[PDB]
Write a protein that binds this ligand. Structure first.
Ligand SMILES: NC(=O)C1=CN([C@@H]2O[C@H](COP(=O)(O)OP(=O)(O)OC[C@H]3O[C@@H](n4cnc5c(N)ncnc54)[C@H](OP(=O)(O)O)[C@@H]3O)[C@@H](O)[C@H]2O)C=CC1
Lengths: 340, 114
């Protein structure tokens, strides 16, 4: 019913007919999804549960009236209704890496996804873009990936023609993966289970993931497809972290920490009522090797060629360098060994 | 030991203020914010480049003037001696030499900069 003819040149003042409701747009991926939508001239609706101040950075991303802010409650389907009522596309990015007092991994990766998918059918939304995790297993060691698998099935049940995207480990300027490893310098050494020799990770750039979501909306065949967004190179955990500490010009001191001890350390950092520095599920997810799913389309099928980590790692970790190694180029550090 | 206690209390209070300053507020840091301030534009050169002193001679002479001030400090106790003639002559001698050094530096254009 809400069908809009695109007009203009695809710029800031153009019309694209991509009126969207980006849930959890106040987050690492959200910013880029909104910015890509905003620059094309799309009516972006941004639900938010935080303070309007935290949503301020999204304001310049769109033209006048192209970015509408309206509050929503994850436990109130009525609030979901009024934010998806006039949207032809709904994107779900709501997800926390740590269980909160009032929200648990089940509540954020199963209940809310299902509510968003269910309500979107009621309002007649055409396309839905759900964002799971590459390593989503119904018997995964981590509850985060456990709920990420249950919610994936429920979305397909509530919204049969919904595009499901499973990013590996998105990395970017405001990322909790590259910054996570680079911030371990404050704790002395770098604790790695089996010295990070038994874990393979395939991180994905934040821009590529965001452009994949936008291309999925533009692509008329993405309805019902399940995508897996991965990077072009697979790295050992030890090799990746060493490269992270290489472009950051920090002394790399890796010591093997046993799994039970590392889990005990993760439990200690969960005490913080604020955002935990690390979590037991965070430890398990980091140590868990990334799955390989060659039966699913990736960024390549959507026309976006994945950017190697080597090209876009200097941006993230430049702020982590000292004054001595601020102006050093991105070519002095040699690329890490890739298990390909 | 009381002075040590006072110093310890002051230092601890200052460091506690630093700790509260750096751990109470909500921190959100990114590369642009922590960049050096150059009135809105990017700096041309490093701030650790040489910065020429146009008053170097003034500082090198301030060294010797501080020396003379150190020599003059014992004067309040020096007035308690019985040899007031010799003490007064020597004190005035030191002050006259200080004035003469200042005058020599002034006339030979040492107090001027550049
Ligand atoms: N590397 C990665 O980060 C990867 C992430 N994913 C998943 O894809 C999505 C990417 O989001 P990401 O950039 O990580 O987001 P962030 O973790 O940076 O921020 C989470 C976002 O979700 C919202 N949110 C979380 N919990 C709730 C809740 N209970 N109620 C309402 N809003 C909530 C937040 O709103 P607010 O800030 O107001 O709380 C915020 O907008 C997430 O679902 C994530 O789990 C998958 C693969 C990789």
């Amino acid at each position: 019913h809400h069908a809009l003819i695109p007009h203009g040149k695809g710029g800031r003042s153009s019309v694209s007919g991509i009126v969207a409701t980006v849930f959890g747009a106040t987050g690492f991926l959200g910013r880029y999804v909104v910015n890509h939508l905003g620059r094309m001239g799309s009516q972006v609706i941004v639900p938010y549960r935080c303070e309007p101040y935290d949503t301020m950075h999204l304001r310049p991303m769109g033209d006048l009236g192209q970015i509408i802010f309206m509050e929503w409650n994850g436990k109130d389907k009525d609030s979901i209704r009024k934010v998806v009522e006039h949207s032809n596309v709904v994107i779900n990015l709501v997800g926390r890496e740590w269980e909160t007092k009032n929200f648990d991994f089940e509540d954020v990766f199963v209940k809310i996804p299902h509510a968003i998918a269910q309500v979107s059918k009621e309002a007649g939304v055409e396309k839905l873009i759900h964002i799971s995790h590459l390593n989503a297993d119904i018997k995964s060691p981590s509850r985060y990936l456990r709920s990420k698998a249950v919610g994936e099935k429920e979305v397909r049940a509530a919204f049969p023609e919904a595009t499901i995207i499973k990013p590996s480990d998105i990395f970017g300027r405001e990322d909790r993966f590259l910054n996570y490893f680079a911030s371990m310098r404050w704790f002395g050494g770098v604790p790695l289970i089996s010295l990070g020799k038994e874990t393979v990770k395939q991180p994905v750039y934040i821009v590529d993931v965001s452009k994949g979501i936008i291309n999925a909306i533009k692509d008329p065949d993405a309805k019902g497809k399940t995508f897996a967004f991965v990077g072009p190179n697979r790295y050992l955990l030890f090799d990746l972290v060493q490269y992270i500490f290489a472009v950051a010009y920090r002394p790399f001191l890796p010591y093997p920490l046993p799994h039970f001890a590392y889990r005990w350390v993760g439990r200690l950092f969960e005490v913080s009522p604020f955002e935990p520095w690390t979590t037991r599920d965070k430890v398990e997810r980091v140590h868990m090797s990334d799955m390989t799913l060659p039966h699913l389309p990736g960024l390549e099928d959507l026309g976006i060629q994945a950017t190697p980590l080597e090209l876009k790692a200097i941006e993230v970790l430049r702020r982590h360098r000292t004054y001595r190694w601020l102006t050093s180029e991105m070519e002095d550090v040699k690329p890490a060994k890739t298990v390909n | 030991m009381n002075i040590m206690l006072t110093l310890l209390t002051n230092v601890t209070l200052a460091s506690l203020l630093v700790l509260i300053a750096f751990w109470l507020p909500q921190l959100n840091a990114y590369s642009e914010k922590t960049s050096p301030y150059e009135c809105g534009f990017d700096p041309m050169g490093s701030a650790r480049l040489p910065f020429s002193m146009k008053f170097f001679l003034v500082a090198i002479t301030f060294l010797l003037f501080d020396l003379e001030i150190a020599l003059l400090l014992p004067l309040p106790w020096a007035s308690q001696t019985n040899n007031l003639k010799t003490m007064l002559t020597m004190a005035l001698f030191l002050l006259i030499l200080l004035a003469a050094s200042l005058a020599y530096e002034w006339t030979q254009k040492g107090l001027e900069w550049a």
